[PDB]
Design a protein around this nucleic acid. Structure first.
Ligand code: MG
Ligand code: MG
Ligand code: NA
Ligand code: NA
Ligand code: NA
Ligand code: NA
Ligand code: NA
Ligand code: NA
Ligand code: NA
Length: 175
DNA sequence: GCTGGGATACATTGTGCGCACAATGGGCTAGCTACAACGAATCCCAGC
């Protein structure tokens, strides 16, 4: 079940060209530019409970179809839970069962979702508390203020990080 | 901090390791086309 960093790196390199989903009988490949490593893996953590992947979906309707009909070529896996935005799989890798999580994020919300899925839980809690003090709500979908999305002139996770007012930290040192 | 996915009340079993969830069983009760029907609200796990 447990796996080291290089093990999960090999798993992501294997899966980067083997992700797809069934869309009304059509097998759709998931491009590697949309597969982003996240979670404890994006941090150079020595040991991994799981491998966390963020798939980027260009259109909104297809969000229903990616994870519920997710497919992997040539790999055995079980599904414990699966919905529109989150899915966990028990993949079989060399006679060991591994946990592999998939999360979806629209392209408009790429920096936010990446940010929410990269940093450690505690770092996220501290950031969201600091933003909430100023009447703001930050999540994987955007910045909100009085139950209203706040537009930001940003495109990457780093531009988000500075536009929001905190010091940038590469994923490793975030804590 | 903020969200996602899967059951939704109350007593009785099989596990692979005194345990814990999916799966039975039965008095109690609302309402009666001897029908049968939403979908938020809620809670408990899960993710970072
Ligand atoms: Mg993980
Ligand atoms: Mg109960
Ligand atoms: Na999806
Ligand atoms: Na997401
Ligand atoms: Na708001
Ligand atoms: Na504003
Ligand atoms: Na910081
Ligand atoms: Na009747
Ligand atoms: Na009848």
């Amino acid at each position: 079940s447990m796996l080291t960093l290089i093990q999960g790196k090999k798993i992501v390199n294997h899966l980067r060209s083997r992700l797809a989903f069934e869309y009304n009988g059509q097998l759709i490949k998931i491009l590697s530019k949309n597969i982003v490593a996240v979670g404890s893996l994006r941090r150079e953590e020595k040991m991994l409970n799981d491998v966390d992947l963020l798939i980027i979906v260009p259109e909104k309707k297809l969000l229903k179809h990616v994870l519920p009909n997710i497919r992997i070529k040539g790999l055995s896996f079980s599904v414990k839970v699966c919905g529109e935005r989150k899915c966990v799989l028990f993949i079989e890798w060399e006679k060991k069962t591994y946990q592999l999580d998939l999360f979806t994020a629209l392209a408009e919300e790429k920096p936010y979702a990446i940010f929410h899925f990269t940093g450690p839980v505690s770092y996220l809690i501290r950031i969201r508390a600091a933003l909430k003090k100023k009447n703001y709500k930050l999540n994987q979908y955007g910045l909100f203020k009085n139950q209203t999305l706040v537009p930001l002139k940003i495109t990457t996770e780093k531009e988000l990080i500075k536009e929001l007012g905190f010091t940038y930290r590469i994923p490793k040192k975030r804590l």
